[PDB]
Amino acid sequence: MQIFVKTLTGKTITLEVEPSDTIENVKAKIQDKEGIPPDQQRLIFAGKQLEDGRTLSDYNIQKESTLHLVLRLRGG
Amino acid sequence: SNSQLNAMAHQIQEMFPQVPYHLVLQDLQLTRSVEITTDNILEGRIQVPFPT
């Protein structure tokens, strides 16, 4: 199924995943596109954080759903 | 001007539909980086809406 990844930069990435896919795997797919390591990838859904060891079915993420990708930076 | 700043803050509001806009603009003036801002917010840097 297809989903929509929202970024803080204002870029809607369209990736293909499945309900039985793991959050960790999703982040890995994003790392292949953006280049940003999954370690600095904070996936948020409906305002809640998505844990690495969880599946899309855990948070009940259906098709055409929007996933928020927050970047982590200990700088500033 | 705050043209880019306000626009960036609005982008975060489109990611976190639970954080007060005025609290977003708070760190937007400090770090001025939506990335570090949302990250710090998620770390508890900004007092999230807590029922008192």
Side-chain angles (χ1 to χ4, degrees), chain A residues 1 7 25 37 53 59 65:
Chain A
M1 69 181 183
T7 46
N25 194 34
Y59 303 95
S65 307

Side-chain angles (χ1 to χ4, degrees), chain A residues 24-76:
Chain A
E24 180 195 85
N25 194 34
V26 181
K27 292 199 294 176
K29 294 176 177 182
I30 304 172
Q31 170 186 29
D32 176 78
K33 291 269 179 172
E34 301 309 283
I36 308 168
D39 244 285
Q40 306 174 329
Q41 287 188 33
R42 308 190 69 152
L43 262 177
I44 275 78
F45 193 68
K48 306 195 303 184
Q49 219 181 212
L50 311 183
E51 299 179 354
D52 294 86
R54 306 286 176 185
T55 61
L56 299 185
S57 308
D58 273 281
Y59 303 95
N60 195 26
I61 304 174
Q62 295 128 90
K63 65 196 196 85
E64 293 144 56
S65 307
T66 323
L67 278 78
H68 303 110
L69 186 68
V70 172
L71 298 184
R72 163 177 275 157
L73 279 94
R74 295 313 201 221

Side-chain angles (χ1 to χ4, degrees), chain A residues 6-11 42 44 46-49 67-76, chain B residues 8 11-18 30-31 33-43:
Chain A
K6 215 176 189 174
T7 46
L8 296 166
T9 3
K11 172 189 184 179
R42 308 190 69 152
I44 275 78
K48 306 195 303 184
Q49 219 181 212
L67 278 78
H68 303 110
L69 186 68
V70 172
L71 298 184
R72 163 177 275 157
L73 279 94
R74 295 313 201 221
Chain B
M8 280 190 297
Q11 188 60 86
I12 301 183
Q13 200 69 34
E14 272 267 297
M15 301 273 288
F16 258 77
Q18 64 203 28
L30 265 302
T31 57
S33 166
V34 291
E35 309 95 313
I36 313 176
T37 297
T38 323
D39 177 44
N40 262 272
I41 290 175
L42 259 151
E43 288 303 337

